[PDB]
């Protein structure tokens, strides 16, 4: 089988439709970066749990109005006050300290003048309140920010630092989340040497394994290095079986064209009994990209057999593998972010949709970024993939300045 | 000292000007994600190191033209050929295999017809070449992609997956890079409990430590958890001394206003003998944000004393701390990426420049993203910080749809 040419849209949709969502596990909240909640999270306490001052100043009775007041004590952060403010009295407060019984407003220190103090100046005795406070001013009532019983995070939330801080706030230190996929990577070819090797006749160094592993690691997922596998079916089958045992996802590169020494598709079908959903994609680069699933004991393994050309391998990894991994780790909409950018140079269109790494840059006050195709600008890694449309009889070329879609693949 | 109000621009520039660049170390290339090269990197081999076929097909003499040819053997990937192609002969080749002596072009299999084979069909014997090849066609000459002696990566390059793959390609498996900063984080306040604690009267859980540690970890830097420190100068000094010993950067939160129990600025100046460069910033939120340096034995430590309010702490961490850490790890221009976005709702301007977390979203074919201020949209973490200008007599409010600056703080 020279597999049918699959459209890019059909290939991508097929990857997402066929990729499973992984099961769940309980983690410590500090380990939650990039995880997706598999439970709703509720507050068991009010925040604040006591009425809390917003200001350094004095807790007062608003009904007393402005005037001169006896200071009966201080409320400091972390201590519950024991005294009750009666008419004509106030209590000093600091930001975050509890409001004492009998007070209903806070007056910030700037709206006061101190009018009696102890001889040694350490104890405030009488203060002039210069304003009419409104009841409740500069107080966070109990539960103002979070109420006991409130759902503070919904299942499906993809967590970042602020969500971790919210779990800390509410004391929910263990949470149910989707698992991350474990991703195994192998390279294929009799010509490949390890990066650590000196060259030998007829040989080159394996770069795809490093590039692909780094790409997956950049997204936070655990990886397994399956090494270099020669161009023979027995070795390929054994390496695939090891990947299936050790990982949720297997990525290979090389050996997927129709060459005399290309065995991977035959091994996947006849030996592994995997279901190849597509074996060619009408895209540039990436024609021989292959995607398969394997259902064993009610678990679905997914296999990407990427082209061997290094540029093709990293482009197809970003287009197909990353969205699948995002679905596996529970992200509800796992699709890439697409930004509109201006082409930095003219480009010829191909009958196939074309993809190329680029750098996105925003310029002073200009609203749209520019996309500069790769290959001081060299100090930056690629953070985008230009997505060029197929040529038509009408449109054969795009011009500098014209707006194109760019897929985000790195931090901007 | 109620410290002077420092403009945002002066505060930010001061942080970057006063922050050092860390020294260098040698790392394994697989550990290079996010590192900055401190050396130029050179290729010691050509790529390809032999003339390499781009195609499955036949190595031919272009001068023979089209016609029927004897196939004298095969060149397979990873094997140096030993035979010389003479007039009237060709050799089978596969993609990435070396071109044999005597051949000067490759004809892809699609431009041929097989016209003699062995009885068992395993050996090709004669092929009809249907095209006139151009000399050099479908061959990558030695060094076409990389030449021995070529600088392939310059010092100052901020590495991603493709740079790691390039180090693998050229066999440079150990590289000199800038160190990453080690960042210590402490929280302050007598009211704070650990996230793991049940509440006690007058107390709340410490969230800032978790949020700040997660923010720093998201950027890839090692962290040290200095815990909760009470509101007293001895304990604050001891915790700062531990941070200085263990880390390059110390982040505190809380205790930086003028309150009765706020000691940190006094401790930094009088006890630690640090140089406080600013102690207030004209910004909303973040008024009491403080930045200090401490020079010990020719090493500069940097200290950020952030406000205690949780929103203020995470906003000021993203504005001031992250750019400093990027400078420390060697990034040449460590400043944030600013994108233009449309406001999703009307906003009132303040005399101070105002900052608020938001979510940036790109809509179908609309060129500019929308910025939706925080507090299915809830499934996403904040990836931006709205940067609102100070009000003027002319401009008091911004309206839905108007374009504003947004600082990127998360993956888009
Ligand atoms: C065909 C459409 C797909 O559409 C679906 O996947 C529908 C089923 C589903 O949403 O699961 O989305 C994708 O992702 C973005 C956000 C950009 C990237 C594009 C992919 C690179 C190609 C498929 C295309 C693509 O366009 O839009
Ligand atoms: C005042 C200018 C500063 O300008 C310098 O830092 C000049 C000295 C130097 O470049 O080192 O850059 C910054 O970073 C961006 C990219 C956006 C973020 C802004 C900061 C939030 C505030 C400072 C401002 C800022 O605007 O531009
Ligand atoms: N891991 C790798 N690192 C670098 N180059 C590779 C790697 N794997 C394959 N290549 C190169 O990519 C090209 C395409 O290889 P491949 O996809 O295996 O084609 P075929 O299936 O026809 O052998 C060849 O030049 C090959 O040497
Ligand atoms: N680590 C923290 N976690 C959550 N809230 C905090 C933290 N530190 C301080 N806060 C709260 O932030 C607010 C401001 O505190 P802070 O900056 O210490 O003010 P002051 O210096 O006046 O005591 C208070 O409500 C305080 O309880
Ligand atoms: Ca191969
Ligand atoms: Ca405090
Ligand atoms: Cl390809
Ligand atoms: Cl603040």
From Swiss-Prot, chains A, B:
Keyword NADP carried by entry: no
PTM note: Phosphorylated. Palmitoylated. Palmitoylation is stimulated by GABA type A receptors activity. Palmitoylation by ZDHHC12 regulates clustering at synapses.
Subcellular location: Postsynaptic cell membrane; Cell membrane; Cytoplasm, Cytosol; Cytoplasm, Cytoskeleton
Primary localization: membrane
Tissue spec: Expressed in tissues including spinal cord, brain, liver, kidney and lung.
Membrane topology of the entry: Lipid-anchor
Catalysed transformations (reactions): molybdopterin + ATP + H(+) = adenylyl-molybdopterin + diphosphate; adenylyl-molybdopterin + molybdate = Mo-molybdopterin + AMP + H(+)
GO molecular function: ATP binding; identical protein binding; metal ion binding; molecular adaptor activity; molybdopterin adenylyltransferase activity; molybdopterin cofactor binding; molybdopterin molybdotransferase activity; nitrate reductase activity
GO biological process: establishment of protein localization; establishment of synaptic specificity at neuromuscular junction; gamma-aminobutyric acid receptor clustering; glycine receptor clustering; Mo-molybdopterin cofactor biosynthetic process; molybdopterin cofactor biosynthetic process; neurotransmitter receptor localization to postsynaptic specialization membrane; protein targeting
Cellular component terms (Gene Ontology): cytoplasm; cytoplasmic side of plasma membrane; cytoskeleton; cytosol; dendrite; dendritic spine; GABA-ergic synapse; glycinergic synapse
Transmembrane segments: none
Enzyme class: transferase
Regulation: Inhibited by copper and tungsten.
Keywords: ATP-binding, Cell membrane, Cell projection, Cytoplasm, Cytoskeleton, Lipoprotein, Magnesium, Membrane, Metal-binding, Molybdenum, Molybdenum cofactor biosynthesis, Multifunctional enzyme, Nucleotide-binding, Palmitate, Phosphoprotein, Postsynaptic cell membrane, Synapse, Transferase
Start and end residues of each stretch annotated as MPT adenylyltransferase: 1-412
Cofactor: Mg(2+)
Pathway: Cofactor biosynthesis; molybdopterin biosynthesis
Domain of life: Eukaryota
General function of this protein: Microtubule-associated protein involved in membrane protein-cytoskeleton interactions. It is thought to anchor the inhibitory glycine receptor (GLYR) to subsynaptic microtubules. Acts as a major instructive molecule at inhibitory synapses, where it also clusters GABA type A receptors.
Family (UniProt): In the N-terminal section; belongs to the MoaB/Mog family. In the C-terminal section; belongs to the MoeA family.
Subunit (UniProt): Homotrimer, homodimer and homooligomer. Interacts with SRGAP2 (via SH3 domain). Interacts with GLRB. Interacts with GABARAP. Interacts with GABRA3. GABRA3 and GLRB occupy overlapping binding sites. Interacts with ARHGAP32; IQSEC3, INSYN1 and INSYN2A.
The protein's name: Gephyrin
Organism annotation: Rattus norvegicus (Rat)
Organism ancestry: Eukaryota, Metazoa, Chordata, Craniata, Vertebrata
Positions spanned in the full protein: 351 to 768 of 768
């Amino acid at each position: 089988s020279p597999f049918p040419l699959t459209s890019m849209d059909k290939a991508f949709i097929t990857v997402l439709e066929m990729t499973p969502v992984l099961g769940t596990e309980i983690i410590n909240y500090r380990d939650g970066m990039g995880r997706v909640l598999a439970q709703d999270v509720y507050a068991k306490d009010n925040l604040p749990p006591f009425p809390a001052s917003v200001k350094d100043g004095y807790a007062v009775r608003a009904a007393d109005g402005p005037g001169d007041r006896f200071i009966i004590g201080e409320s400091q952060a972390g201590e519950q006050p024991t005294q009750t403010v009666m008419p004509g009295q106030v209590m000093r407060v600091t930001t975050g300290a509890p409001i004492p019984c009998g007070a209903d407003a806070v007056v910030q220190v700037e709206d006061t003048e101190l009018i009696r103090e102890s001889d040694d100046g350490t104890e405030e005795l009488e203060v002039r309140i210069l304003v009419q406070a409104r009841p409740g001013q500069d107080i966070r009532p109990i539960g103002h920010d979070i109420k006991r019983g409130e759902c503070v995070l919904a299942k499906g939330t993809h967590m970042g630092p602020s969500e971790i801080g919210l779990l800390a706030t509410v004391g929910v230190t263990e949470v149910e989340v989707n698992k991350f996929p474990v991703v195994a990577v192998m390279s294929t070819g009799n010509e490949l040497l390890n990066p650590e090797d000196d060259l030998l006749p007829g040989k080159i160094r394996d770069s795809n394994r490093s590039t692909l592993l780094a790409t997956i690691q950049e997204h936070g997922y655990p990886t397994i290095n399956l090494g270099i596998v020669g161009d023979n079916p027995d070795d390929l089958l054994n390496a695939l079986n090891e990947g299936i045992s050790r990982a949720d996802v297997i990525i290979t590169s090389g050996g997927v064209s129709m060459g005399e020494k290309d065995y991977l598709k035959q091994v996947l079908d006849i030996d592994l009994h995997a279901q190849i959903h597509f074996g060619r994609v009408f895209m540039k680069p990436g024609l021989p990209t292959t995607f398969a699933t394997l259902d064993i004991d009610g678990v679905r393994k997914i296999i990407f057999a990427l082209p061997g050309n290094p540029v093709s391998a990293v482009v197809t990894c970003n287009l197909f593998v990353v969205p699948a991994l995002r679905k596996m780790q529970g992200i509800l909409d796992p699709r890439p972010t697409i930004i509109k950018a201006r082409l930095s140079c003219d480009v010829k269109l191909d009958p196939r949709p074309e993809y190329h790494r680029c750098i996105l840059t925003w310029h002073h006050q200009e609203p749209l970024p520019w996309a500069q195709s790769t290959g001081l600008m060299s100090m930056r890694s690629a953070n985008g993939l230009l997505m060029l449309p197929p040529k038509t009889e009408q449109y054969v070329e795009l011009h500098k300045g014209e707006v194109v879609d760019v897929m985000v693949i790195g931090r901007l």
